[PDB]
Amino acid sequence: VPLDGGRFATSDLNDLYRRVINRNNRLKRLLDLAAPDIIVRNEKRMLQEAVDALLDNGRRGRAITGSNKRPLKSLADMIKGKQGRFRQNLLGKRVDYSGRSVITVGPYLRLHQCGLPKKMALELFKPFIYGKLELRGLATTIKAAKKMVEREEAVVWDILDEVIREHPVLLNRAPTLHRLGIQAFEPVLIEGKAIQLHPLVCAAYNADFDGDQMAVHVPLTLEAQLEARALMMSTNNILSPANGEPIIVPSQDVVLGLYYMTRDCVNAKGEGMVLTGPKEAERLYRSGLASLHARVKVRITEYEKDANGELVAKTSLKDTTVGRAILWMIVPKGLPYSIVNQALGKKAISKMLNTCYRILGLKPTVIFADQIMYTGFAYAARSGASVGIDDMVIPEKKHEIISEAEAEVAEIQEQFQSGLVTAGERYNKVIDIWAAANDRVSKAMMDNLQTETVINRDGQEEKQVSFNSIYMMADSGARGSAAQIRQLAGMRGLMAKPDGSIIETPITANFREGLNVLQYFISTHGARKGLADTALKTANSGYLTRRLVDVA
Amino acid sequence: VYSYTEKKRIRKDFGKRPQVLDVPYLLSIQLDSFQKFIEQDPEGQYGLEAAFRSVFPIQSYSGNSELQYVSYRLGEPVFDVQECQIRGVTYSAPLRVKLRLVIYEREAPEGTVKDIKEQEVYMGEIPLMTDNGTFVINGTERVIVSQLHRSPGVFFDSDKGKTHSSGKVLYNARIIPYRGSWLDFEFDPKDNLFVRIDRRRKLPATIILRALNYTTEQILDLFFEKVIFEIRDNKLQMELVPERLRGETASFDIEANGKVYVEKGRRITARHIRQLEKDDVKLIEVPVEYIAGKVVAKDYIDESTGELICAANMELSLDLLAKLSQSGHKRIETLFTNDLDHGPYISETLRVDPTNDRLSALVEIYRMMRPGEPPTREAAESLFENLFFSEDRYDLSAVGRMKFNRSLLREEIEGSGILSKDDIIDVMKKLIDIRNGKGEVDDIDHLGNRRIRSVGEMAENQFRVGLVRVERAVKERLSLGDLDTLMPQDMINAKPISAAVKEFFGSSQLSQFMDQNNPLSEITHKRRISALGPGGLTRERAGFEVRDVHPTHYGRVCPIETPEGPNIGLINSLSVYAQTNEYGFLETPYRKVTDGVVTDEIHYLSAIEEGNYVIAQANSNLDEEGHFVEDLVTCRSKGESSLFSRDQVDYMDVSTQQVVSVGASLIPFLEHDDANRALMGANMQRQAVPTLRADKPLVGTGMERAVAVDSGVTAVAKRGGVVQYVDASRIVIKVNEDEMYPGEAGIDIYNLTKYTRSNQNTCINQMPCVSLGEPVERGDVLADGPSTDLGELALGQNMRVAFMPWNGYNFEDSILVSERVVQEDRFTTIHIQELACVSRDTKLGPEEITADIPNVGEAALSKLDESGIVYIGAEVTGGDILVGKVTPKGSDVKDSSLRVPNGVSGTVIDVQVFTRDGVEKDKRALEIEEMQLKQAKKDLSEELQILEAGLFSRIRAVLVAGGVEAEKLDKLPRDRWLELGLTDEEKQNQLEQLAEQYDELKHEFEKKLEAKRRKITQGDDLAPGVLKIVKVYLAVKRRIQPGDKMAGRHGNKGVISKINPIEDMPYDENGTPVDIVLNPLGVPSRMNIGQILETHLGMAAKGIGDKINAMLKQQQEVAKLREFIQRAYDLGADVRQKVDLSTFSDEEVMRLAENLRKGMPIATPVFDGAKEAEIKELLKLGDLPTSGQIRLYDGRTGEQFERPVTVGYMYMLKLNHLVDDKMHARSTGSYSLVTQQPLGGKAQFGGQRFGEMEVWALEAYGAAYTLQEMLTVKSDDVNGRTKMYKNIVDGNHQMEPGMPESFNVLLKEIRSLGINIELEDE
RNA sequence: AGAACCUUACCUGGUCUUGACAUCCACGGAAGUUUUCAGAGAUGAGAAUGUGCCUUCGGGAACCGUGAGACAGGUGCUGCAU
DNA sequence: CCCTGTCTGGCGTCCTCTCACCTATGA
DNA sequence: TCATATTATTACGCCAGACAGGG
């Protein structure tokens, strides 16, 4: 084929075949003419090398080349390699009725449905719309229907909502590693140009929303619609196939909304009042007469199913909070009240959904996963859980710990000037005292964050776990750990140079205090090594998955 | 004092450390390199003169003619840069070289030549550099990126562990020339020394010594010291210097002087060496078992019989001693082969050597280098004497000789370019010393061992390739030269030089397309140091250590600005203050510290000098004298950050920005961010699109000014003065007299580049930021470019941001945006698309440009004229027609008429047409000809008249010393004017002088306008081949929408999720909604805490802005404004700014306060930024709460959010990953040729590659039918997909699968081998 | 839906011939304004004023004059070509 | 003849987007 | 335009697999 212009961009195999035929014609003419021995030996040898270069180029000494120094691609190089026929056109194919766009959240969704734009929906479903238009009788020939959807008149959007309705689509994030990276949804049409994807499902795709893209595929035939609904639907994938752990675990905002909701404080509005049900618990929270965390005797009716498939009601007064009753309005019947009576971090909400799946089955667990996500988003919005510069509380004991460590390294180096100790024992003593001082700084800041709030109730003071914002983001397990909150308040440890050995002078400044120049440069050693490790580790991880699914 | 656009809006500058060295010109690498390449520099170094003095004078092989050189020159470019980008030509210059041919007679080395000839011949065109550091190669604007490669000169590398699988180290030594053959020495685990040349076969290394005319005895003289056995009274005693016994076991009885020194069994200690030196012990009698393992040094022959006793390098036995003792050779020289220190590596290599003399050594080297073809005396000697020893094919440069003498601890640094005997012998000696223990290896990441190539060096190497090809051509033509009938262009040819230099500037791995969407991105693509390219490492192979940051990067390479992905740490970006060494290394400034007092003199160092000295830290507290206020200070000695004394240091860092680059020193509060998020923040900050309304970062670092000036996107004033401000077309600046030349009266007319296409389809546009009649100074800015605001650098815009979860719409990293952001068009960016249409004559006649578009009805002839082509302007969308361009016979007509692509809208801003000389109808082509024709003359006369007006007044102005008669000077109006005599006393010939000016003005204007019409009157200017050349420039205006990507400066990426109404936003109690809600959960994990301090400090900045907006709106007399502005500019600790505000004339306070009512801009520098107490104190100057947190109500429910939230102003950027460039869908369209599967991409309307892991994921489910239609019906099988399309549109979802076509393609490709693959029984 | 002249296309005489009406060049004159004798009048001969928008000055656009032709003109014929 | 360095081949992540550039010769 | 037919750089890192060498 010619490219855009007036010349033909010729393939490499035409060069190979044209050389074999040029040489073969020369050899026939020389055997006609009775050339001497050395001429026809060179001629047959050039034909041998030409045939051997046509079949598998470069297996003989240095491969032939046309333009410019790059070798030209032979038949065996049309078969082998990453870009042969197996790995590029027979195992993986390019696919019609498919689309691709940037994802975004849309938290109003139920977890069996996803948002799909109107422009992509009218392009992916052109033949179904053509068939629907031809059934009604609005048009006659196929051309008329293609002009109608090329113009996009007022009547094809009702046709589109009547071809969408019960027709699942396969959403697919581009590095699909396990089977939960292709899931089938039902479309809900979107004014917009971005796929709205239900948030819980994101933890299956490893999909954040920092610029990600996903592909949509349409199951055309009827068996494929039934496979998308009965095997690949997103309600059907709620447990990861690698183990027994649920994969629709609530990820980050919703566990903060729950951890702020089901908690307590030693005095609030409506401390120790008594409530006749969870409905008036939410009514007291909404009207402005109690607080979301205020300990209260309620009367809850938990249904324990102790018989053989019969739900027995037991009603009692639990000493609980307001938020635990409001969250009890969403729990299905069979679970006991003690699943919400605690503080509900992330491990606790994961085993809440797991006990709901083991007891009440699939359908209450799907609808209860949605109600968890809705109430987590709503009370995280009502929480106003910001992050400030004052939330990262510096330990008051931090500077004296650093000065005691500086006195200790001064003692060790004064022994080093007088030669009492060895050099390796000096390096070991310095790394040991900076590890001990690091642990002491972490314990100072961790006490100063985990119990900083000290509020009185009707008299003398009484302490409790803190409502500091970074501490709830750490204790809830939403985002953060001990190490990250340690590096934002306490000293950020002893960073290591790329030699593999550690550096004897640590980074005594956290991020709330400023790092100076040398400390940031040592930090950049430690972080450039991590980025290089991930960006080169991913190739071995993918090649390991390939070898494993081809031995299986 | 300040300049006049500095007093417009002076940014509140935190920062305690006084800067001593201002920032160098940020494009100096590109400009200094290319100014080195083209410059007339006598003494030859470096440049084009080095190329001509290497290649010339050419003399042929005794052909008695010798073409020599005189001088070269570059003429004017025929196309200036703008019309060069428009047309598509290179931006080049013709290289006029004077060449002087002299031709000899017979027998004239000394005789005078018989004839000369000389001419200014023309070879090539070299592409000049634009004033901003760019090229224009073929219409497009490209940048050569500076390479980072291994220096020439010896390197002693180890490879300690991986080979031999036994933990035994090797030690190789590579002599890397700048041009020529590579010579490597290397041990092997048998402890033998091996040479290899150009990574070829392995020769035992002493053969190269035997190739340098060294006998075996001379080699053993070099690499071994002699132990002397004297034949004496009995048992052949030994000279013993006591150094040789260090650390060995006493095998025999060590006694002398009648005294037993050391007995057998104990090892010899250094106290025993002191005993032997104090007792003066040299000669001791040895047993016969001591010599029975040693090796002879030189040859010995039996004197009377006349034959050989033993060859050199022969081990000794007792009967050999009975041979040599009875002959009469009293001295025996043995080789001291210490197992600890002085190993016998050369001697065992000589035992491996199959050669004996020089000639067989050269024959074996020639059989290594060029195999098959025979090894004769002349051929092998010419090979080996031109491998390393001739000036043509082997040349360590000056850098190579400096590194080569420095790594061998030589004294000198300048020497000859070739090697010698002594250099190869010294490399072998240092390698042996490293094996013995003394001296150590070199590392390759050490930036003293790592040179930079730049534009001038790379273009000079390519130009030298072209010159050696043209000298082989000149040697060709001259021996076939007949004289005198040729002049020097039948010999020389302009083709190979131009071919080579356009090969490099067009298709190389470093001459690459400029990332141009941003002033930052231009100025940080020009400052780029790539490890890749020719002669360097590759992306997909290496490695771990070359991708990692080494302690010599401090102040030379940015540690944190490197692109994430497949090439991390290969594409390093250069630091802010780092220049380039004379040899090409990276030297960075330091402040010389003689004693306690840190001196303000600067001094540049590279990494092979930074190790020796002790260099302080940038921020170490020194007060009022330079004395370090502590008695101990953190420094770094040899790449090790350690704490040293007050008075030991020799250098200090210059300024605290100097570690990082110009991409990541624009991030305020860098020191509070993590390193990873600073990397992601700088790499995204390169990617910002220019918004429609540029908006001044409230929290900047003060480096915005230098980046916005030094990248040439703003129209910086060349000569200061006032202004005339016609400006609709050009800024016209009248020049003050001190900066103004005596002749060339002169006023500067700046060209503003209005709406045009960038390289990334963004819009580069300049707008004047000075009014009419306003003073400007030299170096001041006049026109704000893209993403600039009054000379600062405004990539994104500053918006009110709340940190809270808001109903899930900002879940992972999403961002929830009000409607006030999209109503104000405060991200509505402008994109420009160039679309070409050509009507080439493929076949069956030429194609045609006519509106008489076929089949298609009264839906073709619409946005066009009666003669075809889009009629300009208009609200064109997708599926429209721009250029009717269709042929007959292609009832056989078709529609190739270039239309508008699917999904885009826009306005036709410009239509260019340099078409096939004929595009015209009956007259538009010549209709506009007269328009431009009359235009030229008009301005031509106008300009003359403009100067004439100024000159006429000037005539009268000077008319005072020679006729001031006001009533006797207003005679003729447009006729003459001055008519008075003068004589002498004072020179008033001024009238005569100005008379010539006007006289020459009119005389030159005619000629100027004479060529104008000549140029005007023309078909059009372009190349041949292509016929119909119609380029149409659309300009889409994209706003913002759910799905775009925004980001701050700290690494906080986001896809804007919901575009809320104004009402539903979280409003504080004052009533203002917040603009953008981010998510707090990103902040504890991604440890980029700097965005919060930017949020609080931007809140304080707009607090001052709201306070000034109240004091100026509710208008107060300027005393209260200058008092509040003075309080705002004093504010807190000891800073550098304060202000001199009472000298702003009671109006420059008000113009400043007009430019501050949107918020007081604050410079928070990079590592010496604003502390937290100053943020709190500035939040107390404004009336804002000290915590940074305001209680916010909810727009939905009207009720307060508990636990007050953070609101502030973050500077958020819109990155050019827009969602309606990514949205794509395909049902059915076109496919490829070879395969039956769909095409790929978006510009090709193609479908999604359902790859391999998705097939494994469908196999993981039970999706057997979904996969079957996913690879047979939807993709490949042609009968299956046509039956499926008809089955769908009938209303029958059922597939008739069949077999994929690409599998039958597989069968024919396998079967086209000798392979019979089939398909068996039914 | 209006013939004294005009209208008017008809008759009688007196006259004009690139023309009463247009476009085009060439080159003579700014247009126009006023007034005189002969003649039925058409026309054929005189005296007064003006030079505006712009010129590396081979000149121009409005408005008269002359010659060349290209053309104008025709209420001339065919309503049985329309 | 069983260890053995040494040499030769054969791997090295998926998906996507933008741009430019394409054999010499020649009576 | 229409047949003529291939040369002057090196700088991955294991990891199997086959091969001449020698105690």
For B351, counting Cβ atoms within 10 Å of its Cβ (0-12 exposed, 13-18 middle, 19+ buried), the class is middle
| CA B568/CA B912 separation, integer angstroms | 42
Q: Give B1314's contacts (C-beta < 8 A, 6+ positions apart).
A: none
B28-37 and B455-479 are packed helices; what angle lies between their axes, rounded to 10 degrees?
20
Domain edge (last residue) among B322, B342, B362: B342
Q: How many residues does chain B have?
A: 1322
| CA A421/CA B1268 separation, integer angstroms | 74
- Tell whether B1124 and B1218 lie within a shared domain: yes
Residue B1230 placed within a domain: no
* B1009 Cβ nearer than 7 Å to chain C strand: yes
Q: Which of B1174, B1095, B1090, B1182 is nearest to B1135 (CA)?
A: B1174
Is residue B1274 within 8 Å of A215, Cβ to Cβ?
Answer: no
- The sheet that has B588-592: what strands, in order across it? B602-605, B588-592, B651-653
Q: Give B374's contacts (C-beta < 8 A, 6+ positions apart).
A: none
Q: What amino acid occupies position B127?
A: P
- Tell whether B1157 and B1044 lie within a shared domain: yes
- Tell whether B468 and B511 lie within a shared domain: yes
Nucleotide nearest to B1013 (CA to C1'): C56
Q: What amino acid occupies position B148?
A: L
| CA B1032/CA B836 separation, integer angstroms | 6
Nucleic strand E interface residues, CB < 7 Å: A 15, 19, 22-23, 26, 46, 64-66, 69; B 149-150, 162, 176, 181-182, 198-200, 535-538, 541-543
Smallest Cβ–Cβ distance between A105 and the set B814, B1169, B1250 belongs to B814
Q: Phi and psi at residue A533, in whole multiples of 5°?
A: -65, -40
Residue B284 placed within a domain: yes
Q: Which of B997, B998, B958 is nearest to B980 (CA)?
A: B958
Residue B1031 bridge partners (DSSP): B836, B912
Residue A189 bridge partners (DSSP): A116
How many Cβ atoms from other residues are within 10 Å of residue B24's Cβ?
A: 14
Torsion of CA B42, B45, B49, B54, to 10 degrees: 120
Q: Which of A377, A370, A368 is nearest to A340 (CA)?
A: A368
Instruction: Pick out residues 5-34 of chain A having their CB under 7 A from any atom of nucleic acid strand D.
Output: 7, 9
Q: What amino acid occupies position B1113?
A: K
Q: What is the least distance, in Å, from the CA of B176 to any CA of chain A? A: 25
* B1000 Cβ nearer than 7 Å to chain C strand: no
Instruction: Pick out residues 936-965 of chain B having their CB under 7 A from any atom of nucleic acid strand C.
Output: 941
The answer to whether the CB atoms of B1248 and A150 lie below 8 A apart is: no
- Tell whether B1119 and B1208 lie within a shared domain: yes
* B1007 Cβ nearer than 7 Å to chain C strand: yes
- Tell whether B358 and B428 lie within a shared domain: yes
Residue A203 Cα to chain centre, angstroms: 5
The count of domains in chain B is 9
| CA B47/CA B41 separation, integer angstroms | 7
For B757, counting Cβ atoms within 10 Å of its Cβ (0-12 exposed, 13-18 middle, 19+ buried), the class is buried
Determination technique used: cryo-EM
Q: Give A425's contacts (C-beta < 8 A, 6+ positions apart).
A: none
Q: Which of B878, B846, B849, B848 is nearest to B864 (CA)?
A: B849
| CA B545/CA B543 separation, integer angstroms | 6
Mutation target among B1189, B1242, B1289 for the A interface, most CBs of A within 10 A: B1289
The answer to whether the CB atoms of A104 and B1192 lie below 8 A apart is: no
DSSP, collapsed to helix, strand or coil, labels residue B1202 as coil
| CA B368/CA B362 separation, integer angstroms | 10
Chain B hits for A134, CB-CB cut-off 8 Å, are: 1289
Residue B1009 placed within a domain: yes
Is residue B1178 within 8 Å of B1132, Cβ to Cβ?
Answer: yes
Residue B430 placed within a domain: yes
- Tell whether B681 and B808 lie within a shared domain: yes
| CA B896/CA A4 separation, integer angstroms | 13
Chain A hits for B1199, CB-CB cut-off 8 Å, are: 288
Strand ranges inside A321-418, DSSP E: none
* B999 Cβ nearer than 7 Å to chain C strand: no
Mutation target among B1199, B1227, B1303, B1313 for the A interface, most CBs of A within 10 A: B1227
The answer to whether the CB atoms of B1045 and A78 lie below 8 A apart is: no
| CA A128/CA A285 separation, integer angstroms | 50
CATH code of the domain in which B768 resides: 2.40.50.100
Nucleotide nearest to A8 (CA to C1'): D22
The answer to whether the CB atoms of A193 and B1041 lie below 8 A apart is: yes
B1038: enclosing H helix or E strand = strand B1030-1038
CATH code of the domain in which B794 resides: 2.40.270.10
- Tell whether B648 and B675 lie within a shared domain: no
Chain A hits for B1251, CB-CB cut-off 8 Å, are: 92, 176
Is residue B1121 within 8 Å of B1157, Cβ to Cβ?
Answer: no
**CA quadruple B405, B411, B414, B417: dihedral positive or negative?**
negative
Is residue B709 within 8 Å of B769, Cβ to Cβ?
Answer: no
* Nearest residue of chain B to residue A199 (CA atoms): B811
Is residue B227 within 8 Å of B333, Cβ to Cβ?
Answer: yes
Torsion of CA B799, B800, B803, B806, to 10 degrees: -100
Residue recorded with tokens 């992905």: B565
Is residue B871 within 8 Å of B865, Cβ to Cβ?
Answer: yes
Residue B275 placed within a domain: yes
- D chain positions with any atom within 7 Å of a protein CB: 5-7, 10-24
B1246-1249: long-range contacts at Cβ-Cβ below 8 A with a sequence spacing of 24 or more? B1246/A94, B1247/A94, B1247/A95, B1247/A96, B1247/A97, B1247/A98, B1248/A94, B1248/A95, B1248/A98, B1248/A99, B1248/A100, B1248/A215, B1248/A217, B1249/A92, B1249/A93, B1249/A94, B1249/A95
- Going by the DSSP 8-state scheme, the letter that residue B412 receives in this structure is -
CATH code of the domain in which B650 resides: 2.30.150.10
Torsion of CA B1090, B1096, B1102, B1104, to 10 degrees: -120
Q: What amino acid occupies position B47?
A: G
**CA quadruple B1062, B1066, B1072, B1078: dihedral positive or negative?**
negative
CATH code of the domain in which B876 resides: 2.40.50.150
How many Cβ atoms from other residues are within 10 Å of residue B1069's Cβ?
A: 10
Is residue A253 within 8 Å of A377, Cβ to Cβ?
Answer: yes
- Going by the DSSP 8-state scheme, the letter that residue A90 receives in this structure is I
Alpha helices in B233-357 (DSSP H): 270-278, 318-325, 345-352
Domain edge (last residue) among B574, B593, B626: B574
DSSP, collapsed to helix, strand or coil, labels residue A249 as coil
Residue B701 placed within a domain: yes
The angstrom resolution of this structure is 4.1
User: CA angle at residue B1057 from B1056 to B1059, to 5 degrees?
Assistant: 90
Q: Give B1292's contacts (C-beta < 8 A, 6+ positions apart).
A: none
Residue B2 placed within a domain: no
- Tell whether B184 and B126 lie within a shared domain: no
Domain edge (last residue) among B443, B470, B490: B443
Chain B hits for A257, CB-CB cut-off 8 Å, are: 805
CA of A9 to C1' of E2 (A): 19
Half-sphere exposure of B833 (CA within 13 A, CB side): 19
Strand ranges inside A257-311, DSSP E: 274-275, 296-304
Q: Phi and psi at residue B261, in whole multiples of 5°?
A: -80, -65
- Tell whether B121 and B162 lie within a shared domain: no
| CA B498/CA B496 separation, integer angstroms | 6
Residue B3 placed within a domain: no
| CA B679/CA B1050 separation, integer angstroms | 9
The answer to whether the CB atoms of B1248 and A388 lie below 8 A apart is: no
SS3 assignment for B686-722? CCECCCCCCECCCEECCCHHHHHHHCCCCCECCCCEC
Nucleotide nearest to B1005 (CA to C1'): C56
Half-sphere exposure of B1194 (CA within 13 A, CB side): 18
The domain of B272 spans 225-342
* B563 Cβ nearer than 7 Å to chain D strand: no
B360: enclosing H helix or E strand = helix B358-369
The DSSP bridge pattern shows strands B146-150 and B450-453 to be antiparallel
N-terminal to C-terminal alpha carbon distance within chain A:
41
Chain B hits for A485, CB-CB cut-off 8 Å, are: 1084
- Tell whether B144 and B158 lie within a shared domain: no
B675-685 and A517-551 are packed helices; what angle lies between their axes, rounded to 10 degrees?
80
| CA B730/CA A518 separation, integer angstroms | 49
- Tell whether B210 and B349 lie within a shared domain: yes
- C chain positions with any atom within 7 Å of a protein CB: 55-56
A363-383 and A347-360 are packed helices; what angle lies between their axes, rounded to 10 degrees?
150
Q: What amino acid occupies position B1262?
A: G
Is residue B1052 within 8 Å of A209, Cβ to Cβ?
Answer: no
If phi > 0 it is left, if psi is from -120 to 50 it is alpha, else beta; for residue B4 that is alpha
SS3 assignment for A142-176? HHHHHHHHHHCCCCHHHHHHHHHCCCCEEEEECCC
- Tell whether B869 and B934 lie within a shared domain: no
Both tokens assigned to B271:
């106290």
